[model samples]
Target: VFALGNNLGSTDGYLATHSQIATKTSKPLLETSQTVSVITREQIDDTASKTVQQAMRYTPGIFTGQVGASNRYDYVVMRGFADNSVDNIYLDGLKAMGDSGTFSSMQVDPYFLERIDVLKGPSSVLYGRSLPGGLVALTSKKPLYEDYRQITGSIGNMGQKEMGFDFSGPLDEEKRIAYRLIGLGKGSDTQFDHVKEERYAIAPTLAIDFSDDTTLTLQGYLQHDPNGGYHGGVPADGTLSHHNGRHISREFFDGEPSKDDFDRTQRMFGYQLEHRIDDVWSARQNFRYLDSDVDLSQVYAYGWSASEPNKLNRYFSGAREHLQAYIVDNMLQAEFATGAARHTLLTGLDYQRRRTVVDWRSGSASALDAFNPVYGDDAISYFPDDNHTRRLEQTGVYLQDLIDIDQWRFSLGLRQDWVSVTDKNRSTGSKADDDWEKFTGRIGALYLFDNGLAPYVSYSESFNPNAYSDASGTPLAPTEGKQWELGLKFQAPGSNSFYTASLFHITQENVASKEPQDNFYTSVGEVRSQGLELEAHTQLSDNLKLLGSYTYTDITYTKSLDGNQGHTPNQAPKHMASLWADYAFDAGPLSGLSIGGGARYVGETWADKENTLRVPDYTLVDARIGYDLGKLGLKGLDVSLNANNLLDKDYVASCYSLDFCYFGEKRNVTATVNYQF
Candidate 1:
C-alpha cells in the first residue's frame, strides 16, 4: 500500500532510474534539461546522516554548516546564494518553512526519509516563491504493503546516544489497510562545556485502499527538544581574521551558562488522496497543517571595543516565535497520444496561509576576558524590543506539458501567483498590508542520441515576495529571478555509470539594501551568479562505486546602495570539489564488509562585501566502514562506523557582517547497529 512518490529514489538500492520532480511527469533525468541530484536512502544509512545538512554537504554547488553546530536547523546554501534570503525548501513536494532564527522545520530526521532531491535552478514556474539557486524536496517513508520492522542503536564520541524503531504492516486480512510507525530518542553532549542536547520524535501513518482506482493516506508526527544548544560565536578579529596576531581557539566559549537556553517543539498532520477518473486521467490532493514554537536567550561577542583592542563588547539577546500554517495542493494529470507525438499534461492550483507572532529583545553587557571567560549572575536581563504578528496568504495556478517526438523531448510550463501580506506593528500600534500578482514561465528541449548521449537547454523564471516593510509602511515589490542553462549527460551502454556537465547563469533583480546612513530600506539593486558544474555517479566493477562533483562560481552584486557592488557576498566561495568512493569485498576474507572515504574542499574568499577581510580556504576528510552479519547466519543485521572531520579541522565555517564568527565542527565519530525483521 506504500505510495511510491517519485522516481528520484534509487530503484535498485544503489543507482537511480526515474524522477517526476523535475518535470512533474515520470521521466529519466537525462531527458530533463534542469540540474537535479538525488541522495538515496542507502547513502543516508551508510553515512549515518541524522540531518539534511549531512546529506547535502557533498552535492555540487552546495555549502553546509553556516552556523557551526548550533543544532537548531539545517543551514544550507547553494550556488553562492543563502537560503535565509530565499525560502527554497519543501517536504513531500509541498513547501515547509525552514527559516531558523525564530521558527523552523522538523528536525527532519533522515531516518524518516525515503530520499531527498535537489532541484538546482529557478523553479517558480512549478513551485512558486523561490530563488534562482533552486529548491530541495524530501519524501518520507510510508506504510509498507508487506510486513516490515527495524530497530537501531548508536553511540558516539561527543557523548552521543540514540535509540530508534520503525514498524509497518497490513492492518486487515483483506489487505485493504496498512499502518506504519517510527520513533527515535536521542541525547548527547556538544563540544562546548555546560551545554546539552536532547530530542524525541514519533511519526505514524495509515493507508486505505478505497478501491482499485482510489486511495487515501493519513500521516502525523511530533517532535520536541526541551533544551537546545547555542554557539553564538566570537568576534572575527580573533577568529577568521586576526588582530595584532591574536588567535582564537576553535573551542572558545563566549556565552554565559546561566544566560543561554533554546527550546523548540513541532507538530504536523497531513493527508493525501488520489482518484483515477479514467485510464488516461487522474486527480490528486495533498493537505497538511503545521505548528511550531521556539524560545531562545543567548549571549554573543558582537565586536571589539573602540578603546580596547583585546576586549569585545557583549551582546545579549532573547527571541521567540509561535507559528501555524495550513497548506494544500491539488492537481490533475492527463496522458494522450497525438499521431506520432505523445503528451503528458498537468495542471494544479494550490493555496497556503501562514500566521505567526514574534517577540525580540537585546541589550549590552560587560566585556569578558578573551582567553578565559567568567560566569556571572543577574548581569544581563531582557526587555521587549519588537512584538508583532504577521500573516501571509499565497495562491497559485500552474500548468505544464511534456511532449515526446521520436528521440526529441520538449517541455513547457507557466504559472501565476497572488501573494497577500499583512502585519500588525504591536510596538507602535501601526499596520502594514500589501498584495501583488506575478507571472512566470519555463521552457526546455532535449535530443537523445542513439549512442547514449543527451544534450539539453532550458530557460526559467522565479519570483519571491519581499516580507519587509519600510518606515513609511510601504511594501516593496517581489524579487525577480531569471536563469539560462545548458547541459550534457551520458550513460554507459553496459554499466551503471552516469555523467553530467552543466553551465548556468542566473540574474536576481530588485534586491534590498538598507543604508546605515539613512536607516532606510530600498529595493535598489541586482545580484548575478554564473557557474559551471560537473558530476559522476558510477558502479565501477560490481564491487566498487564512486560519486564525484566539482563547481566553479562567479557571484557579485551588479548594483547596490551598501557599497557592495561588484564584490562577491560573504560565504560565497568561488570553487568547490568533492569525491567519495565505496568498496565492498565480494569473495575475499573480508567478505560482507565495506569501507568508504572522501574529502571535500572549499575555496578561499572574503568575509565582507568589500573583499578585504580574508577567510582562508579549508578541506575536510571523512570515512566510514560497515559489516553485514547476514553473511554469517545472522539475517538482517549490520553495524557501521562513521567519522567526520577526520583530521580535526581548524577553520571558520562562516562569518557575519556584524563581526560574529562561526567555527566548523571538529572530529566526531559514531558507531551504529541496525537490525530488520
Candidate 2:
C-alpha cells in the first residue's frame, strides 16, 4: 500500500514511505538544482540536541560557538557572509527576531518542532531580506489524524537530565478539530567548574477545520532559563597554554565562585488561518507576539600584571534588560489560473512595537580580595548608578506576484517601511531620537527544462537601522544591502532527491565603524561578498539517504576608514563542506533499524575584521543509530543513540571581543526513546 516517488502522488504511497518514523513525518520533499539537504525528526531525536544550537550541529554551513556557560550563540555564515543579523530566521512563514540584535538569539527548544527546511541559495523571491547563502525555515508539528501520546526522559554526562512529553489527537467525533501540547524540563553543567543551567518550556497548539476548504491554527509557548555569565576565556596572549581544544578549562573571577548566574525568560503566542476561496484561489494570514526579560551580573576582573594576581583588582559591573515586543501581521495570498497561465499573488501589512529598559551599575569592591568567592546575592558596597530606556516602532507594507508562463516562472516583490527609535538617559536627564523611511524590492525568474532541471536568477535588497550615532549625537541613516544570485536546481528521477548550485554577489554600503574618538563612530564604508555554493539531498535507494553541501567565498571590504580592506570577515571561512548518510534495514528482524553519520570541514578563518589573528580550520564527525520495535507489544516504540564530534577533534569553536575564545566540545553522547499510539 505504501509507495514512494519524487513527484506528488497518492496519500497511501506518501504514508508508506514515511509511516514508521516519527522523525521524518509530514515533510515536503523538494527537488531543485542547487545544493540540498533534509533534516528529519529522527535526526533530531538521535542527536539529543539540548538547545536549538545542538539541533543544528549536523547541518552544513552552520557553525555554533559558545558565548557563555550555557548561553552559547550561533554565528551562521552562508555563502561567505555572516547572517547573525535578525534577517535570517523564519518560523513557519513568518519572521522571528530577538529584541535588538541582528540574529535571533532567543532560545528555541526543539521538542515541539516537526522538521526544518534549508534552501542554500538566494531565496529572496519567496523569503525576503535573507543572506546571500540562503535561509533556514523551521516547520512546526501540526495536529494529525492519528492519536498519539508519549513521554521521554534522558540523562547524560555533566549532570545533564531532560524530560519531555507530547500528545495530539482529534478533539471531536467528526475529527474537524484537533489539539497538541508539548513540554520539557532540563538541567545541565558546562565545561566550567561550577557553571550550570536549568530550563523549562511548554507549548500548546489548536487547530480547527472550518470546512473542507478552510483551516485555522493557534499556538503559544513559554520558556524560562537561568545560567551563569560569559566565563571569560583564556588570556588572548596564549600564555595560559589553554589552546588544547576541550582541554581548555573554564574560568571565573578570582574572588568569585566558579559560578556567576544570570536569568532569561521569553513568551510567544501566534495564530494562522488558511482558506481555499475557490478552485484556483486561496488566502492565508499569520500573527505573533513576544515578551522577553533578562537579568545578569558578573564580577569584573582587571589587572594584567602577574604580580597582582591576588590583588583586589578593580570593580564590578552588571546590566539588566527588560523588553516587550508586539507584532501584528496580515497577509492575503491568492493562486489562480488565467487561460493557460498560472499566477500567485500575495499582499501583506505588518507592524511592530518594542519597549526596552536597561539598568546598569559599576562600583569598586574594596573589601573583597581578588581570590575571594562572590555569590550571586552578595552585596556591592560601592554601587555606581546608571539607567537608560529605549523605545522602537516599525511598520511595513508589501506585495508580491508570481507568474508562471509556459516553463518559466517570474516573481516581483516590493516593500516600504518606517522605523523610529527614542533613547533616554535616566542618569543624565538627556534624550535622543531618530526616524527613517525605507523601501526594499526583489525580482526573480525561474526557467524549467525537461528532466527535472530548473535555472533561476534573482536580485534583492535590505535596509537596517544604524545602532550608533554620529558626532552631533544624531542617529545615522540605515545601511543598505543588496545581492544578485544565479542558480540551478535538480530533482532526481523517481526518488526524493534534490540538488542546488548557486553563485552570488552581495554588497553592504554605509557600514558603521568606530571613529578615532572613543565616543563616536562613522557609517561611511562599504563591504562585498561573492561566493559559490552547491548542496544536495537524495534517497539513493529505499534504505539509504545522503546529504551534502559545499561553499567557496571571496569576501572583502571595498572601502572603509577602519582599514579592514580585503580581509575576510571574522569567522567567514573561504571554504566549507559537509556530508552525511543514513541507511535503514529494509527487511529483517530489525526491518526498521537505521544508522547514519556526518562530517564537516571549515577552512581557516580570521578572528577579526583585520585578519590579524587566525582561528585554525576544524573537521568534526557525528554518528547515530536507531531501532523500531514492530512485532513486540511495543510496536510503535523507537529508540536511538547519537555521538557528536565522534573523532574527538579539538579546536576553537568561536572567538569574539578580542581577548575571548571558546573551545569546541569533545565527543559527547545521548540516548533517546519514543513511543507512538
* Candidate whose TM-score is highest: 1
Model 1 gets an lDDT of 0.80
Q: What is the C-alpha local distance difference test score of candidate 2?
A: 0.63
Q: Which parts of model 1 are misplaced by more than 4 Å?
A: 1-5, 8-10, 83-86, 98-101, 104-106, 241-246, 307-309, 381-384, 514-516
Instruction: Report the C-alpha lDDT of model 2 over 223-338, residue by residue, as the tens digit.
Output: 88876324454333331243324333334333344325567787889887767676655566666777777776565444333444323344566668787777666666666788
TM-score of each: 0.96, 0.86
Residue-level lDDT tens digits of model 1 in 1-677: 12223453235434576676777556787778788888888877766666787788778888775676666676667788774632667888788853432454456778789878888888998878877788888889989889999999999987989999999999899888999999999988877767888889999999998998888989998888877855577767778655655656446365667777778888999998878787678878888888988787877677777876666678787778788888898888887899998887889999988888888788777776666566684276555598778788889999988899999989999999999888887898988888889999999999999787899999999988764456577777878989999999888765688888989999988877876687668887789999998988888768888889999989999988888789998888899998888899878779889999889898886677777786788899989999988889899999999998899887887776537667887787999999999
The weakest ten consecutive residues by lDDT in model 1 span 1-10
Winning model by lDDT: 1
RMSD (CA, Å), each prediction: 2.1, 5.3
